[PDB]
Amino acid sequence: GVGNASGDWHCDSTWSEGKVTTTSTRTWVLPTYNNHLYLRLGTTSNSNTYNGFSTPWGYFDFNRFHCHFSPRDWQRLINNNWGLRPKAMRVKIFNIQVKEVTTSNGETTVANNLTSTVQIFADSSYELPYVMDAGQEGSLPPFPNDVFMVPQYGYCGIVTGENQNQTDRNAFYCLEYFPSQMLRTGNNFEMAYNFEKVPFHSMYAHSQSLDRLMNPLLDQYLWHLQSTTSGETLNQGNAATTFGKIRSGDFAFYRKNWLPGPCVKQQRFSKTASQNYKIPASGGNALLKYDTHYTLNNRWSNIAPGPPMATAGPSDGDFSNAQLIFPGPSVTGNTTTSANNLLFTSEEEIAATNPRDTDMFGQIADNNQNATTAPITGNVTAMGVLPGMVWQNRDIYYQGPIWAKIPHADGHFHPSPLIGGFGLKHPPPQIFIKNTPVPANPATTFTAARVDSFITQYSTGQVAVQIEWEIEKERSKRWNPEVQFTSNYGNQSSMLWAPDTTGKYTEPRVIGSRYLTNHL
Amino acid sequence: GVGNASGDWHCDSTWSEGKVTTTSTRTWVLPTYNNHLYLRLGTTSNSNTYNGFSTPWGYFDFNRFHCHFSPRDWQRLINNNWGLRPKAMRVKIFNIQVKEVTTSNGETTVANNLTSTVQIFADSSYELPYVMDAGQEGSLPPFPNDVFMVPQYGYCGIVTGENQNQTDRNAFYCLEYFPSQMLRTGNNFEMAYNFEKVPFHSMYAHSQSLDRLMNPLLDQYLWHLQSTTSGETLNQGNAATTFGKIRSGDFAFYRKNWLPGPCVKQQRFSKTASQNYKIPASGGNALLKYDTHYTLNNRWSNIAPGPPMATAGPSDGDFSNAQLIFPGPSVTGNTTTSANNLLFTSEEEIAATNPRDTDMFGQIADNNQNATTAPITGNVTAMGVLPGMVWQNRDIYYQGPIWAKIPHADGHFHPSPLIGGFGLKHPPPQIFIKNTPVPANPATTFTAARVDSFITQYSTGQVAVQIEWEIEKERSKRWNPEVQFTSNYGNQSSMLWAPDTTGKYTEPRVIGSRYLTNHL
Amino acid sequence: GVGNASGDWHCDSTWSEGKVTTTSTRTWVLPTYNNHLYLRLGTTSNSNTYNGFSTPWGYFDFNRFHCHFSPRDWQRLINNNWGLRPKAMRVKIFNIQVKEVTTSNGETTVANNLTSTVQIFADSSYELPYVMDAGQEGSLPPFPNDVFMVPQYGYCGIVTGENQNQTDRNAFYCLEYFPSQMLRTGNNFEMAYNFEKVPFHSMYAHSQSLDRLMNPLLDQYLWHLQSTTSGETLNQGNAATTFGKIRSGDFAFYRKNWLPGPCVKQQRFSKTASQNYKIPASGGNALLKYDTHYTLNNRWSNIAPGPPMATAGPSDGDFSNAQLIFPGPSVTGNTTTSANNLLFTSEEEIAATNPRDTDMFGQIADNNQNATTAPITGNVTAMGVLPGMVWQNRDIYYQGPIWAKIPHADGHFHPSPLIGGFGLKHPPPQIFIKNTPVPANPATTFTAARVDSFITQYSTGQVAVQIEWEIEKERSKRWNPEVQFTSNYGNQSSMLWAPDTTGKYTEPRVIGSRYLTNHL
Ligand SMILES: Nc1ncnc2c1ncn2[C@H]1C[C@H](O)[C@@H](COP(=O)(O)O)O1
Ligand SMILES: Nc1ncnc2c1ncn2[C@H]1C[C@H](O)[C@@H](COP(=O)(O)O)O1
């Protein structure tokens, strides 16, 4: 009925010995996009050209972690458990209120239209292109008491060449072609979903460095050739070759059982403006050209933080493109001069297992040495996976995405979003929503032309998302106290992680999940 | 209730090994026609005069194919099955929203009137004159997200003579005389119907030409007279008559078992303006007079695309009145100079079985030859059906009508709408709808005169139509790959068969159903 | 509920071998009469004075035939059956919509007031004075798609003398003193009733003339005196009286078994202005005085079409007050000069059984003849019923009333409304309706005076009436084809019995029910 609420606002976290369940609700506003029509989209810009469509529909996105975890909760989670992975989810939209706007002259009036319908469907079948997954605004806001605007749905189409235009292959997906539920106030929508078994994300830092796992005290039983000649001078000395049983201490020489990492090199820049070479953002030598990129169908796509690699700590004066950058509290606009106002994610913790972003993978003999010809070593920058390699994935972040859909392709290797998160073949479905059109008074004599005059409307209501996370406690045997993340903030005039006098809420730092320790 | 939606918007196609089921929904607007009154109609113009009535009611029409098939679906259908025929249908109207308009000065305001009634009835009994069937706008729009205006219902009355006026025979049908359902928001209407067994429409092209079905290798065992005299000169030669056993190769002479087609000749025009003789559109020699027409009760009615016949291909520079013409994307107004902006349907495929539109049926001896008198052949233009004739019907088109009602008459022959489609004795019933009147404030003292002051209202809601089609797969034994319809469009700036940047949607080409092949 | 319709609009006729059932619906508007108060009424004009009251209530009246029969139906009925008589009825009012009017300056605004009540009761008990019965507007309109205004209820009180004033006897009936149902939107009202057995109305014309029913071939066996004297001259001749056996041919002399009619003479006027004597409408010799009237309690009441009698055919140049006059299509105002614009009912058919309106009943010997004194015949103008009389009742008319209530009196004779129709002791009850009052904002301090400030309101909804008629087929043995009523209208520019270009609907002719024939 019109008079009855169709759902209660509950946001909660319930913790278990084995599983924690998060639940949060938010209020949303839904405009009328593109005055009700699908629009072709395309621009051709050389290293950017793209093509696609913009839709009258909007969608709900809960892909950021902070959507379901209050800071404290995130804390609880990461200081206590080694791994976590999502198990099941369920969503419900309710208290739909459709508003109609009179828009008188000078003043715009708004009043409820009780008999109006907003339509929601979610598609399981994954027939619509998935977009919820990468790098984008629209997720519910972290702070509960913040109303948000449902994002408009638009999708990309395959672009052939450096020039944007469409081939027969390009396709059009029309949301109205799908069956969807129609609601009015007093109507509600609900759906459930079960995640697929997925590797627990590792929420620990290695307490051992891969290269040396051996017993410091003993020495291998293998021998290596130590020197072709005597002395410490490169090209002089007595001819004889000498072999020696690998002894305790010459660890760098120990034959090991594993190779540390897959790797792609990244350019490095210094946070101090002064240190960098001059590089423009446009023109023949715009930065893009010098930053590690992957050429695809004639178009440079700059590699996103790439195959997981070690990166300078957050405080460090140098930073690489490999690390993710978050706004930070103080920044006002879209652009800023000093990087002291930004937040940098860093994977120092990964260093124990795999190569550094700005440094190389290693160096290989790139030549066959000989008495008359000197040995030459080649610098290796790109290294595909090799038998016996072991690496760590990029960590997840409080404000980082949670899942991402694994491309529907013949081949994929070690799916783990590179931006961080769990790779799913069938990820939480995008739930679409749109305000049904309505018509302005219409002409008395019939005209075939499609109607174009519509009443102005917008809707609002609350959505509630609940996720059941499966986690695993630590159970370590380490004796010395671990590192844990605790605020440690100095005396503050207006406390952190809280709304302020203005009433504004902003997240102070970016937070990872690897504080606990574990050995290899 | 007011608060609950009364139906969900589902548009879908579900495909089966034997039957495909289409389902689509749309939103509609219903004005108030003729300020609530039935109006007599008639004009007397000489080759057009007509008489009838216009009604306050409106009706739903789903007679165009594209109403139920998305382009892709239509594709799927035609590249795979030989025949198709509709089996059953069901419709439902819901989410009725009645609006009332304040119409203040300068600004017109619109607000919901919750307690208002719109009335729908559909008549099975076919007591009202059927009109849904021919050549007319009003069908639901092809693209789902397009709102449409319900068509106003008006019907024609029998006109006697070249002058319009009415005889006692003329009749008046008043929609209020039928019982109909009354709805308010929260009320819905639904109905079902079952098509009658009907010949599967042929969705194939003949891979054999009727005239020669015989075995190329052998020769008949019959003899024909080949020549009355010797030489190759028409009136000279040796007297003797010669007979010869019909041999392989003289196929044109083979006695056959069947005659190719029923036929009516059509004038032909050239797409190149220059080629045609000059012909006005008005006056004593307006085109109408020269285009093949059938005289009925003193009135020329120009024959619609006539008895199925072969027609020039679409690209051809010449076109006949026999072919159907569709607007085409680019055309702006009601009229255009160059036919390059139009779309032409063509029945080249039919050529294998029956005569060409612009050419004749054949030529008959129109005389008894004799040694002193030469033989004369008559050109045959009109040919009624003869025993042993076999012909193909006009193809259906993606945007062509689907069914048409078979006239209630003593005699009909080979009912197949000539415009294309399935001929039904009892076709899907016309569903009528109208907004119930309401009254402006009315005078305090009683007056017999019928009330004439009404509140201004219009309504809107969605209708959903579902049709269950019975189809039959091909099962051919042809070895070489068939022709199939695939887009083949060149690189396009704004892809075809899709909305564009303006947001406009228009169909690129007219599409038939005969791409698959089959032998006679 | 507010959102649900409370009844469907069905108008229908279903025909049976023995009984036809009519059903029709209409939409109505109900004002607020007399600003909510009963008002005394009286004027004293000499031959008109009257006294009574006007009520805030309104009533539904379905007393005209055309309310339930579409022309065609009426046709079907009368060309096929000899008699008809109503059997049962049932009514229902629904979709009540109460409107409230804002009445701003210059512009009057109207909006729904959902919580408002309109009250309906029908009284069986016949405690309220019946008025539905005679000669009055307010019946539902014939054409279905015509909205009508509910009539205001007012009743007459007994007037003593030529002067209007009231005696103790005069009574006041207050509708609020009766229990009535209260409705709001979503509420509906319904009631049923059963007619009482009543003589089938005769829908036939006599094919025999009363005066001669005897066998033309034979001659009575009685003798009458033919002549007192010889010759053909009135006062001369031979004395002897002569008697003669009544022979075949001297039919006027045959002693018969029955007397033809009850009768009252009527003045006759000629449709041609020229023929009449000059007579004013006012003053000492206003027409009224010369037109046959019945003096009651000192007041002339002009006799309504009187005791059934024969009347000139409709086309005839002379017409009498005995015939009923209907407006006719073309007439614009309340008054007209030429009677060619009117419609006249006529009872030529009755002539076979009873006397003519303008002519006399017969002539009686008004004296005792004697040899010295001549015989004198008296002209008889008024003739009460005599043993052995047989007469026909006035016919019913398509637009004539159906029933009328038989006065509650000690004595009534051969009840048959004189205006035509069925006489019932307990006729279909008057159904009363009124919009409940509502109050304008009222003063903060209490005042005993009855409230007088009310919000302005009016209501509307549909009423549906169903009547079950019992009819009896003809079953005649007449050989020659009967007369039947068929349109026979000439070619018309705008067909008859139908709405026109203006959209106006008007009935062309008045139609009776006696087309079929039957013998005495
Ligand atoms: N996040 C995520 N989603 C899906 N699949 C993943 C993910 N991370 C690793 N993998 C895959 C990569 C290999 O297919 C497999 C190896 O199992 P392992 O047990 O890791 O040796 O696990
Ligand atoms: N579209 C359509 N509707 C109704 N009747 C049709 C149609 N097409 C052909 N026919 C009729 C014409 C003949 O009555 C009959 C011959 O059956 P046949 O099997 O074709 O030899 O089929």
Ligand SMILES: Nc1ncnc2c1ncn2[C@H]1C[C@H](O)[C@@H](COP(=O)(O)O)O1
């Ligand atoms: N219309 C109507 N209503 C009520 N009573 C009527 C009517 N017409 C005639 N009568 C009465 C008059 C006598 O009381 C009775 C004679 O029955 P009969 O069978 O006619 O000889 O029928």
